[PDB]
Each structure stands twice: as structure tokens, then as C-alpha cells.
Paper text:
Human D-2-HGDH is a member of the 2-hydroxy acid dehydrogenase subfamily of the VAO/PCMH flavoprotein family. Regardless of their promiscuous metabolic origins, D-2-HG and L-2-HG can be converted back to 2-OG by two mitochondrial enzymes in humans, namely D-2-HG and L-2-HG dehydrogenases (D-2-HGDH and L-2-HGDH). Like other members of the VAO/PCMH flavoprotein family, D-2-HGDH is comprised of two major domains named the FAD-binding domain and the substrate-binding domain supplemented with a small C-terminal domain. The active site resides at the interface of the FAD-binding domain and the substrate-binding domain, and consists of the FAD-binding site and the substrate-binding site.
Crystallization of D-2-HGDH in the absence of any ligands yielded crystals of D-2-HGDH in apo form. Structure of the apo D-2-HGDH was solved at 2.20 Å resolution, and structures of D-2-HGDH in complexes with D-2-HG, D-MAL, D-LAC, L-2-HG, and 2-OG were solved at 2.65 Å, 2.80 Å, 2.62 Å, 3.00 Å, and 2.80 Å resolution, respectively. The asymmetric unit contains two D-2-HGDH molecules with essentially identical conformation. In all the structures, there is a FAD non-covalently bound to the active site, which is apparently co-purified with the enzyme, indicating that D-2-HGDH binds FAD tightly. In the apo D-2-HGDH structure, there is no metal ion or ligand bound at the active site. In the apo structure, the substrate-binding site is occupied by several water molecules; in the D-2-HG-bound structure, there are a Zn2+ and a D-2-HG bound at the substrate-binding site. The structural comparison shows that the binding of Zn2+ and D-2-HG does not induce notable conformational changes at the substrate-binding site as well except for Glu475 which adopts a different side-chain conformation to interact with the Zn2+. In all the D-2-HGDH structures, the FAD assumes an elongated conformation with the isoalloxazine ring in a distal position from the AMP moiety.
Residue numbers in the entry:
A (entry chain B): 53 to 519
B (entry chain A): 54 to 519
Write the structure that this text describes.
């Protein structure tokens, strides 16, 4: 059981200070604070008594200045779609929301450089840049709710990572407010700049424990002229792996996504979201996207790829689409898996990097190990990046099932020299299992970084680093 | 400017170093001459000790000793850096990675390379290309630069347009801190969000925060087809429109877009005796493509050239897919920096500017100095907004320096640009970062330096302001 650290509490005088700093941006009604206190999975509830919703970087600076002087803990929050308990308070930390920091500052129609506030919603930024023939360098199933500042803070991966890479590469600059309210200006909207240390990198993946991101400068790829999606049934995981290998060999540079899911995933999306499968029933499914400049060439590459995959028995049934409507329908089958799982019951969630050759082994194992105690066990995700999403559903949480899952799943991953948190990050849930993926000396340097940047520890206590 | 109060190497220090790295203690004064002079040959240190460790543990024991004794250390790779970062200012110990040159592993499927910091870039390219992979970066200094130095300087280079930053392609680092502590961030995972991305601090840290000893890096697959078009353009408006059309018509196969002006071509012909393959033009553009289907690439290139030649964007062009002729065309661009240093004294600027006004400073400087310069040239990575600006003179003039500085830095700042796009900061640029970075940023940089190396023994006098 975690113990509340000796922070102060919010007084009426603090509430009047916040009303001065952000007029109309202070929410205190207990019924209104219910939702922002509960995480996306609905298995964690905080006891925060104040939600602050600033509009500007200066307002965030003044809020944190006040909290630093008063020794008040702060819980940054974006879209609240995070999966690891980082997004809601543990006790009574002030919820500092970016919901109203949702303005675009500038967009350069030649460089493709976007500069916008941290609370812009990913899907809305995609619509904005696509109107100008660019795309966001990342996409994820949470796009409708997650904030760009949240994506940077968690170092979100997602569905086009294989093509455009990490936020560590695509973020050009950040504005960050530090714990004492210092505005750190690293908002360098330049493709290249080697003038000292890359300070912004510290805040990518730091999950709001080192500062609050208020403005983001991000490189947007050009919008592809041609997008294709193929959705394929494979008769086993070995054929999934050869379909991936063959796919890289025959599609090459136009590959923009490679996702897999198992039969149980398909059944749950069908059962809870009523989405019919467009291919024959198979034990594994694969979604492939391509993105390129020449429709004709991409079609020829894809045509030959399918022919060879179908010819050599890697794929048993497959369908292809270019019409935007049909493309979105195929993508829904993968994107909405996470929703279908949470409608199925209580979800035990694991987000692992493993050797691609052994990515599905743990799923087969756990189906045997838990038996009928698990309502379902699934494996899916970013196979091209070595990333498995392992989930177990049950009618209700149980201590018996948790004891079967942990530490067994984490030991498997360490045995494979894998990551116990591939993309979702650490937050509250995984803060004490980092030893399975990171050595002690690295963990200590992280602690020193935290002490340097937030010596009072008012920013997101109880998370990201070990206790 | 003035030597900080570090200890001096005694006879007992030499004997300690001989125990730690037997055979790797060079004290011969004639042998120390070359490692004390930077690549441009305008800076020269007075170090009397060169250490050549073989392993990471040897590096750790050296720094433990240097930390206890308060001796300054100057890490050195291939010594091709351009900003005086790689050579001592006074009598700093030169720690060379020259002997840290082994490949440790290479996964033939994932393309993940683990190697020691002193592996030469050219040699790593050879190694992974024999296995159908390529390095994610390439530079004109490939023959000499070390992968450790590339990571320490956050090198950009000639295929950055396609594969992007080392901040993205580097998967893991082993770093030895100033006190000897071995920091293990040598993960080989594509995705790992288990805490802070500590390795990122050392990419671009220029040896002031730790010595990189091992690098893990993601190698892209080797392309089936590489094409190079070397094109002559009748003006910079056409250079910019050739770039725009190139992105629309070549797209995802594009792997390089470089430009150079007429004077650059003249200088490589004069000093290096390399002939131009196209008609004389005011500007030249080198376009590279890399793709998986050679026929699709050739069709894309065909339609692009036809349109560019047809619309007057390009006047004359030559294409190559043969490896020998591709290197010939590339040599015309890669060897400009060499041709300039043979033209006389070189004033060198490496700027990030809006692409639409990348060449304006070249035109401005030509009017501003007129006959007081020998040549003013502009070339470089136009696709990434990165201009290499050089002025040559028959000899150095404090006058010409006063005309160039601060003027060039102020122009760049007026464009919200970077006064060092690629080459970094080192000794030369430590006091001009204010044109690209605000004081609060520079202050936090100093706080990180104080945390990781409180004694300041690693690379004094560089990277951060005085
Ligand atoms: C359906 C679904 C699909 C998903 N798919 C993916 C996927 O493919 N890949 C992936 O990586 N993740 C995925 N996620 C989780 C992912 O982390 C979030 O979707 C997103 O990255 C977080 O954005 P947010 O604004 O919701 O952040 P929040 O949940 O609000 O917060 C995330 C963390 O960052 C901190 N934080 C938030 N905003 C800021 C800020 N401005 N400055 C500093 N710290 C801040 C918070 O305190 C918290 O610790 C998915 C989630 C869902 C529900
Ligand atoms: C012809 C030519 C072309 C070039 N082209 C480019 C180009 O296109 N793009 C570009 O970005 N640069 C370019 N450069 C310069 C570039 O910075 C270096 O060539 C390259 O980055 C590798 O440097 P190096 O191994 O020679 O390191 P050095 O010059 O030896 O060292 C550079 C700096 O890094 C530090 N350092 C070196 N090794 C380590 C280590 N293991 N750990 C910690 N710190 C270390 C040194 O202390 C120093 O501050 C070019 C140089 C030349 C001569």
C-alpha cells in the first residue's frame, strides 16, 4: 500500500489564487471531479479536489509557481487515455488539464512543420494537416481523445511507427514548464540544429515527472498520394512471420504499417462491436498498409506480393482496399480491439517488446496456464516493431489470477531480454517492475535527473521511477 | 582562453596508465603532434599524453584515475570534427578510441548492429553491406570518422533526408562517466518505454557528459536500386522548384537532395582535378533515390526528368545506377570541403535556414565583401534546410572576420535559424549559441554538465558557454 507523501493540501486561499491565475478554469464540484479522477481502464480512482484548465503557457507557469511555493503536488493530464495509471492522482494531487490548450500556432506548408499547444487532440491535428496535404507522423486508436502533449510525454508509438519512427525523431521542439514555474523554451522549429544538448529529449517519455509540455513543434510527413490496405488470414504464426519477411522484401519502402491479431481478437470485435470479418476464419490475421507517391507502382508491388503470399501458402484468404471508406473499415478491426476487450470484462494488460520469432509464445502458454479462469486471452499488435499487446479478460478481477500472471509474465520478458513496457510507459502501474528491463545504475541516474529538475517532487509523484 | 586549475600528469600517473592500458600510453612528442591539431589545421593543443584503450573497462579505470587526480581528458575519435572539439586547448589527456574497433554483434534479420565506439564509419558500411544492410548515416568523412564521434556530435549527413536523426536510429549506448561509472543503456530493442530515455542526453553531447564506448544502431535494409541524377539548374528559383517537384514525383524513394553553386564546381575542378559531367550552370543538384523495385524507380525518375527538362527547371542532367559512376557523381559533392581548404583560408559557417531563403546570405555576402574575398560559396543539404556557407581568402584577415561576424550569426538569428546545423559547438562556437538558444536553455545545459561531470574534467573549454 502506497503512503501519501507530506505535501500540503488545497485551501480556499489556494482556490482563490487559482481563480486569479486562470479565470473560469477552476473546477471544484465533487461530481465533476469524478471522471478526471478515474483512469481509462476504470480500475483506479484518485481523490483530487481541484481540476485546473489553463489556456496559456503563462497560466501553467503561474500555477506551478504557486504549487512550488505552497508544496502542492500536481497531476498533469491530457486526453486521459493512458493505460498505466500515470494520468490520474493517487491521493489529492491537483489535476492540471491541457484540454483548453488546443490552439495551433503555425503550420509551414513547405517544411511540413506543425507548432501547436499540448492539448490539441491528435485526430483534430490530423484533420488540420491533411487539409493541407500533410499527415501526422503518428496515429493510434486513442486518436479521438489523446492530446499531442500526452503522446510526447508517454513517447507514444502507434500504427505508423514502422514508417515514420519515434517521437524522439519527429519532435522538433518543445515548450516545457518546470516544477518551479520556469518556462523552458526549446521550441526550435528547425529540421537540424546541433547547438548544444538536445534538452527536449529529456521530456519525451518522461510522463510529466520532469515538466509539463505546453507547446509542441512536430515534423509532419507529406500526405501520400496512394494508400492501400490488405487484410489477410494466415494459417499459423510461422506464416505470419514469413508474411512479414516477404512483405518487407516485396513492398519495401512503401510499407507503412504491419499489424497482427489472433482469432480471439476477431471474435471479440465481432461480438461486442458487431464488425464482420471480411476474410475466412483463420487463427491469425494481418493488416498491411502501404503509402506511396505512385498508385500504379504501389498496386503492382502489392499485386505481386499477394500472388506470392497466396501462392506459397503464407496467406489462406485476403482482401484489399483503396476506397477511403473500405480502408477505414479494415483499420477498425485492429484499432477497436482495445475497446472490445474492455467491454468483455476486467482486463489484465501487458505491453511487451519480445523477439519477433517468439512474440506469440506467451499467449499460447497463458491460455494453458490460466484455463477457464480467463474468459479470454489475446495477443495482437505491432509485429513489425517487435511489440506484443497481451491481454487477459475475466468476469471480475481476482487475486488468484493476478498471482498466476505476475511475476511470470515479467520473468518471461526478462528471460528474452525484452521490455516490460514497450509503449504505454511506466506511470503508477509499472514503476516497481523496471528492474526487469533496466539496470540499477541507469535507474539511479534517472532519480538524479528527477531531483535536479523537480527537487520538491510535486510533479506526478508515485509514478515513472521506482519507490 | 585561460587554463583551468587541473593537475599535471606526473611520472606516477604515467605508471598508473601503463598498468591500466599496457602498450597504449603514447608520450613520444613527435607522435603527439598529429592528434593535437584539428582537421582544419587552425587549432593545436599541447597534450603530452595519448592513451589508446582497447576495452570499456580500460576506459572506466582511466577516468576513475583522472577523476581522483583531477586531470582533464579530451576524448577523440577520427578527429574530423570541424569546431575544435576534438583536440586539447592546453595539456588535456587525449583519450583515443582508435583501438576500440570491434563489431560486437549483428542480427542479420533485424539489422541491429552493436559495435565499439572506435569503429570507422566506412568500415561499418562495408561490414553491414556485405550482409545486405546499410548504415543509417553517411558523411564525406566516412574514411576516418568513428561511430562514437558521429553519435557524440549527432552527425547529420547525406542520407538524413531518408533515415533521419541518430536520436531516432541509435537504439542503445554504453557510456563511461567522468568518475569511471559505466552507464549501461545498451538496449537493442526497437521500442522500450521503461523510464527516461537517458541515451539521448549523450547524442550530441560532444564528449562533455561521458565517453561513448559502445553503440547499438538500427541499420536500414540495403536498397536493391540506387540511382543518382546530377542536374544543372539555371537559377536558385529552379533549384527550389526542382526540389518541390522531386518530392511530388519521386516521393518515398528519395534518399538525398544536395545542391552546390557554380563556384563550388569550379573549385573542385581546380584543386581536385575532377571534371564536371554536365554543361556549366549557376547551380547543380545531386538527387539520390533508393528503392526495392528498380523498374518502378526508373519509371519515376524518367517522368521526373522529362518534366524537369521539359519545363526548363533543369537545363542538363546525367544519371547513374552503376556503383562506379554513382561514387564519381557523389565525389563532386562530397569533396567540396576539401577543395575549399585548398583554396586558401576558409571561413566556415554551417547554418539551418528556411529553404526558401537558403541562398540569400550567399548573394548578400558577395555584395557586402565584393573584392575583399577570394570566393563566397553556398552548398549542402537543401532538403533539410542546411546551408554550408564558406568564404575563402588567400590569407586570413581580421578585417574579413569583422565583416563576417557577428553579421552572419545575426542574419541567421533574424531567420530564427541555427548557427550550427550539423558540426556542433566544440571550442569554436561555444560563445555564439545565444543566436539560437535562449539563456534558460543554456543554463539547464550547464546544470546537466555539473551533475554528470562536477569536476569538469571531460572536454573543458567547449560545447557550453564560458
Ligand atoms: C484505444 C486506445 C489505443 C491506444 N493505442 C496506443 C498505441 O497504439 N500506442 C501507444 O503508445 N499508446 C496507445 N494508447 C495509450 C497512449 O499512451 C495514449 O493513447 C496517449 O499516448 C496518451 O495521451 P493522453 O493525452 O490521453 O495522455 P494522458 O493519459 O492524459 O497522460 C499520459 C501521461 O503523460 C502525462 N502527461 C499528459 N499530458 C502531459 C503534458 N502536456 N505534459 C507532461 N506530461 C503530460 C500524464 O500525467 C500521464 O502520466 C492507447 C490508448 C487507448 C485507449
Ligand atoms: C570531409 C568532411 C565531411 C564532413 N561531413 C559532415 C556531414 O555531412 N555532416 C556532419 O554532421 N558532420 C560532417 N563532418 C564533421 C563530423 O562532425 C565528423 O566528421 C563526424 O561527426 C565524426 O567525427 P569524428 O569521429 O572524427 O570525431 P572527433 O572529431 O574525433 O570528435 C568530435 C567530438 O566528439 C567527441 N567525441 C569523439 N569520440 C567520442 C566518444 N567516443 N565519446 C564521447 N565523445 C566523443 C570529441 O571530444 C569531440 O568534441 C565532416 C567532416 C569532414 C572532414
Amino acid at each position: 500500500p502506497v503512503r501519501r507523501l507530506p505535501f500540503s493540501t488545497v485551501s480556499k486561499q489556494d482556490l482563490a489564487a487559482f481563480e486569479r491565475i486562470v479565470p473560469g478554469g477552476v473546477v471544484t464540484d465533487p461530481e465533476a471531479l469524478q471522471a478526471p479522477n478515474v483512469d481509462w481502464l476504470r480500475t483506479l480512482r484518485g481523490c483530487s479536489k481541484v481540476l485546473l484548465r489553463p489556456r496559456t503557457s503563462e497560466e501553467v507557469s503561474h500555477i506551478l509557481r504557486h504549487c512550488h511555493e505552497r508544496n502542492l503536488a500536481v497531476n498533469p493530464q491530457g486526453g486521459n487515455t493512458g493505460m498505466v495509471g500515470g494520468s490520474v492522482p493517487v491521493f489529492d494531487e491537483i489535476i492540471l488539464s491541457t484540454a483548453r490548450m488546443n490552439r495551433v500556432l503555425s503550420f509551414h506548408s513547405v517544411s511540413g512543420i506543425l507548432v501547436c499547444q499540448a492539448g490539441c487532440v491528435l485526430e483534430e491535428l490530423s484533420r488540420y494537416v491533411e487539409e493541407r496535404d500533410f499527415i501526422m507522423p503518428l496515429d493510434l486508436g486513442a486518436k479521438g481523445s489523446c492530446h499531442i502533449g500526452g503522446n510526447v510525454a508517454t513517447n507514444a508509438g502507434g500504427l505508423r511507427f514502422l514508417r515514420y519512427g519515434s517521437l524522439h525523431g519527429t519532435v522538433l521542439g518543445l515548450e516545457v514548464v518546470l516544477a518551479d514555474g520556469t518556462v523552458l523554451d526549446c521550441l526550435t522549429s528547425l529540421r537540424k540544429d546541433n547547438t548544444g544538448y538536445d534538452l527536449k529529449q529529456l521530456f519525451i517519455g518522461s510522463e510529466g515527472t520532469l515538466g509539463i509540455i505546453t507547446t509542441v513543434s512536430i515534423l509532419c510527413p507529406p500526405k501520400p498520394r496512394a494508400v492501400n490496405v490488405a487484410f489477410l488470414g494466415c494459417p499459423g504464426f510461422a506464416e505470419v512471420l514469413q508474411t512479414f519477411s516477404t512483405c518487407k522484401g516485396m513492398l519495401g519502402e512503401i510499407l507503412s504499417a504491419f499489424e497482427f491479431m489472433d482469432a480471439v481478437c476477431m471474435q471479440l470485435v465481432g461480438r461486442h462491436l458487431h464488425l464482420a470479418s471480411p476474410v475466412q476464419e483463420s487463427p491469425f490475421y494481418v493488416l498491411i498498409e502501404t503509402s506511396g507517391s505512385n498508385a500504379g507502382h504501389d498496386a503492382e508491388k502489392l499485386g505481386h506480393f499477394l500472388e506470392h503470399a497466396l501462392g506459397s501458402g503464407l496467406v489462406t484468404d485476403g482482401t484489399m482496399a483503396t476506397d477511403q471508406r473500405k480502408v477505414k473499415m479494415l483499420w477498425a478491426l485492429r484499432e477497436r480491439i482495445t475497446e472490445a476487450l474492455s467491454r468483455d470484462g476486467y482486463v489484465y494488460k501487458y505491453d511487451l517488446s519480445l523477439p519477433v520469432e517468439r512474440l506469440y509464445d506467451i499467449v499460447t502458454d497463458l491460455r494453458a496456464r490460466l484455463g477457464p479462469h480467463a474468459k479470454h486471452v489475446v495477443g495482437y499488435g505491432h509485429l513489425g516493431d517487435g511489440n506484443l499487446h497481451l491481454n487477459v479478460t475475466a468476469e471480475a478481477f481476482s487475486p488468484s489470477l493476478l498471482a498466476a500472471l505476475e511475476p511470470h509474465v515479467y520473468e518471461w520478458t526478462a528471460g528474452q531480454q525484452g521490455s516490460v513496457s514497450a509503449e504505454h510507459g511506466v506511470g503508477f502501474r509499472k514503476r516497481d517492475v523496471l528492474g526487469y528491463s533496466k539496470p540499477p545504475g541507469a535507474l539511479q541516474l534517472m532519480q538524479q535527473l528527477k531531483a535536479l529538475l523537480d527537487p520538491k517532487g510535486i510533479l506526478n509523484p508515485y509514478k515513472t521511477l521506482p519507490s
